[PDB]
Amino acid sequence: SQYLLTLVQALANESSEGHIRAAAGIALKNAFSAREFARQAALQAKWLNQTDQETRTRVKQLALETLASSNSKAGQAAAQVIAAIAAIELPRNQWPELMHALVRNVSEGGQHQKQASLTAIGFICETQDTDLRNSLVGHSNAILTAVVQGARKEEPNNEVRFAAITALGDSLEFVGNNFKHEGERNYIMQVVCEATQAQDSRIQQGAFGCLNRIMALYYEHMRYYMEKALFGLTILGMKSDDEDVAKLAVEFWSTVCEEEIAIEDDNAQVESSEQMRPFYNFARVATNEVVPVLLQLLTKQDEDASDDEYNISRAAYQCLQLYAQAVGSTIIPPVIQFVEHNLRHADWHFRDAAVSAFGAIMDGPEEKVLEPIVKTGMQPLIAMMEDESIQVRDSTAYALGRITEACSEAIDPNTHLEPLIRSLFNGLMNSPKMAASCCWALMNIAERFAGEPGAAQNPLTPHFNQSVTNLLTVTAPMNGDSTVRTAAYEVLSVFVQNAANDSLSAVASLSTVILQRLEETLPLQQQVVSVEDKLILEDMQTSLCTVLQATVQRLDKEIAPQGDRIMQVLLQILSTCGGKSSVPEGVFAAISALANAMEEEFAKYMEAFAPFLYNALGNQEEPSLCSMAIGLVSDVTRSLGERSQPYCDNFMNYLLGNLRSTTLANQFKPAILQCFGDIASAIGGHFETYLTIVAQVLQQAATITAGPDGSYEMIDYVISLREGIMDAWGGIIGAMKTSNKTNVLQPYVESIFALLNSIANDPNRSEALMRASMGVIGDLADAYPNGQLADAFRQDWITAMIRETRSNREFGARTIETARWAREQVKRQIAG
Structure with a gap:
């Protein structure tokens, strides 16, 4: 009270040093405000109640008068205090007309007084609060007209225009209403076109x-203000010798291409024009004037600039990509x-700007229009790999690499493929600095x-x-750069994945070499002492395990002689690895390949590997390894089939035990329920034992929803979750179908349809969920020949579901074909 008077009078007190005054006002705002939430309400109680009217009148008077104080600091904290008082009083229909007067202070008051006024408007508008803004929409008028008055050329101070545009930046957090009327919008766009005209950079x-924003x-x-001056204005700012201003000038069309990407990708989703969002085609019109500036900003460069710090050329390139993906072929x-x-x-x-530019535009424009020149100018481009720079x-x-990913067809094999390969290899094997790109291109x-x-x-095949020899060559050294080693193994893994049958024998020899190197790592495990040594050996073992996977997937059934040595070295690797390592994960990948390859022949490895x-x-505590372990359970059991049963009991205890969670969102659950499916398909009849529990969990899982609070997170979780549920019911029905035990599968069928209903009513659906949905439908048809499901089948939501499924062209082959099959199953099931 008297406390508050001494404080605020100190806030008004010119004779005291300004920093002390700032301390006084900042102390006063913090007598009634904080970043903290509930204590804010407590301080509000200290405002309205403990000290009722008190001097709140005299306080607000002293604060508004303090706005006119010569110090920016005095008006700094004064603006802060008014900013607090507004946040409590104005909504409560308190403080009224104390806002309207502020505008008159803006349009007529003193210079520092202008600082503190717009500074107050800034400090108030910064907050995001739906009810605060609900009471602020009514005051938005005075705010917008004020910031119009202050940013004017007619206005002298630059700093008042900083506070004005800052007031714009946080006021426009609230576009509620935003005055649809074009008059005020005319003055605003005028004062913003004005705002970009300033000689000042800032x-x-x-x-x-x-x-x-x-x-x-x-x-x-x-849309209307855009169509003339703004193009040349934006070009003028893009050309600016200023950097950060050039950066924001870049940020425009960055944002433009963003929103127009969102609209271009919402206009294909349109079934009818009422669904259409407005589209302005700003990009395709602007580009012929905007792009030359983008080259001009590419030629400029800074090697002295620290890497991964944004630069005018850098953002020019990225935005050139944004145009490339929005403007389409029209960018060319x-x-x-x-x-x-x-x-x-x-x-x-x-030259760097040249190839960066031609390396910028392959993505977006349609293939064949890209073809003729890429088929033409390619050869010099390979010749340019010899460049000094x-x-x-x-x-x-x-x-x-972008040319590979795009017009791969443009690379005429006999007259371009070999030189390109030799270039990328030699540049890999001799120029580490350019190595990674050379890898990526080759993978493509x-x-x-x-x-x-x-x-x-x-x-x-000829190359x-x-x-393979070149890749083993560059990967050979124990002291090679870790990055080049890793990328080289990755490119190797990709050549192995994509290889002709004539080359299988070669890949076989390669597989042996990989095993040999993996074995050699095990003594190396012992020589490790530095932590760097650990990271190197782990990345090395990870790379070898990956390439080994590629060999096994491609060799398929031919891998069998290798299998003993493979399981021996891998299981030895598991015993020596520990902690945060990517190795075990990759090893389960390679084992997974070996299991899918050897299939039932794998079963001898199960006694030791289990x-x-x-x-x-x-x-x-190793979530990624645990997930890899579940997927590997699915792999083992799907491949061994009936053989895997004795292991399945222990598998089910680990899965069911992994279902226990303190979080509703168990991140493993979709994988586990899916694994129930795979286990079911593999076992057949003996899955009956698990059926009483599995069904419970599935009946549980169906009830889970993101709710009205819909994060993309929780939604995708529920979707993958139900993908797991449907995969599970599918496998279970199949097992019951082949076990002559459908009668025990009777009770749960209504719940299954209830889930199908729950899915059909859900806009949020995945293609795979619908495939599994269709498959469960038809499986239910085969499961129950009697036709007593026909009266369940005959409902409209079923038929509209299946038809919406098969009708869609977005989905791939597997899904629609299953839909056809399901519908045939249903129509047949209508009578029997």
């Missing part, structure tokens, strides 16, 4: 930033022009020239053994 920064806001009225015509100019240029800034060599490499070649399935040969699997299942 005012332009606030201007372009607020204009950015606004371009994320009222695009609707914006400027870019090629600038590439046509610069490709042979002496200055390396221009390793950075340019690097950018050429990534450009090459493998994916693109894999050839027809079952093929005796693929385009890669294959030389490739404990490792159990142990991986029992430790949630």
Whole structure:
């Protein structure tokens, strides 16, 4: 009380040093405000009640008068105090007209007084509060007209315009109403076009930033203001010698391409135009004026700049990608022009900018229009791998990889494929700095020239053994750069994945080599002492296990002689590994390949490997390994079939035990229920023992929902969850169907339909969920020939569900075919 008077009078007290005054007002706001929530309400009790009217009148008077104090600091804390008082009093229909007067202070008051006024408007508008803003919508008028008055050329101070645009930036957090009327919007867009005109850099920064958030806001009225001056204004700012202003000038079209991407990708989802969101096609119009500036900002570069710090060229490149993915093929015509100019240029800034540019536009534009020049200008581009500038060599490499990913067909094999390979290998084996791109490009070649399935040969085959030899060559050293080793093994794993049958024998020899190297790591496990040594050996073992997986998946059934040595070395690796390591995870991958390959022949490995699997299942403290263990349970049992039963009891105890959770959202549950499915399909009749419990859990799991609080998280969780439930019922019905025990499967069928209903009524659905849905439908048809399910089948939601399924073209083959099969099953089941 008297406390409050001494404080606020100290706030008004000019004779005291300004920092002390700031201490006084900051102390006073904190006598009634904090970032903390509930204590805020307590302080509000200290405002309204403990000290009822008191001087709150005199306090607010002293604060409003303190706004006019010469110090910015005095008006700093004064603005803070008014900012607090408003947050309590104005909604309560307290403080009224104390807001209206503030605008008059803005349009007529003193210069520092203007600082404190707009500073108050800023400090108030910064908060995100739906009821606060509910009472602030009524005051939004005075706020917007005020910030109009203050940002004016007519206004002298720059700092008042900083506070004005800052007031814009946090006021526009609230676009509620936002005055749909075009008049006020005209003055606003005028004062913002004005705001970008400032000779000052910093005012332009606030201007372009607020204009950015606004371009994320009222695009609707914006459509008309856009169509003339703004293009050349934006070009003027993009050309600015200023950096951070150039960065925000970039951030515009960054945001523009973002929202227009969202709309372009909502307009294909349209079934009818009422569904349509507005679209403005700002990009395709702007590009022919905007793009040349993007090249011009690419030629400029800074090697001295720290890596992964954003730069004008950097953001220009990223935004050029955004145009590339929104503007579509329409982006092409400027870019090629600038590439046509610069490709042979002496200055390396221009060559790097060249290939970075041509390496920017392959994505987005449709394939064949890309083909003719990519089929034409490619050869010099390979010739440019010999460039003096390793950075340019690097950018050429990534450009090459993008060409692979895009117009793979553009690479005529006989007259381009070999040189490109030799270039990427030599650049890998001699130039580590450009190595990673060379890897990525090569992986793409493998994916693109894999050839027809079952093929005796693929385009890669002649280059294959030389490739494997080169990769084993670069991976050979124990002191090679860890990154180049890893990437080289990854590219190798990909050539192995994508290889012709004629090369299988070669891959077989390769597999032996991998095992050999894996075995050799085990003594190396012992030589480790530095932590770096641990990271290297773990990454090394991880890479070898991965490539080994590739060999096993491709060799398929031919891997059998290798299998003993494989399980021996891998199980030895498990015994020596421990803790946060990626190794065991990769080892289960390789074992998983060996199990799917050997299938029932794997069963001899189960007696020794089972404990490792159990142990991986029992430790949630290794979530990724536990998940890998569950998936591997599914793999083992699906491959061994009936053989896997004795193990299945222990498998079920680890799965069912893993269902126990203190969190409703068990992250393993979808995988576990799915594993129930796979276990069911494999076992058949003996799954009956588990049926009483499994069904319970499935009946449980169906009840789970994201609720009205719908994170993308919880939604996707429920979706994958029900994918697990349907996979589970599918396998269980199949097992019951082949066990002559459908009668015990009788009770749960109504719950199954209830789930199908729950899914059909849900907009949020996955393709796989619908595939499994269809399959469970038909499985139910085969399960119950009697036709007593027909009266359950005949309901509209079933038929509309199946038809909505098969009708959709977005889904792949498997799903729609299952839908056809299901519908035939249903129509047949209508009578019997």
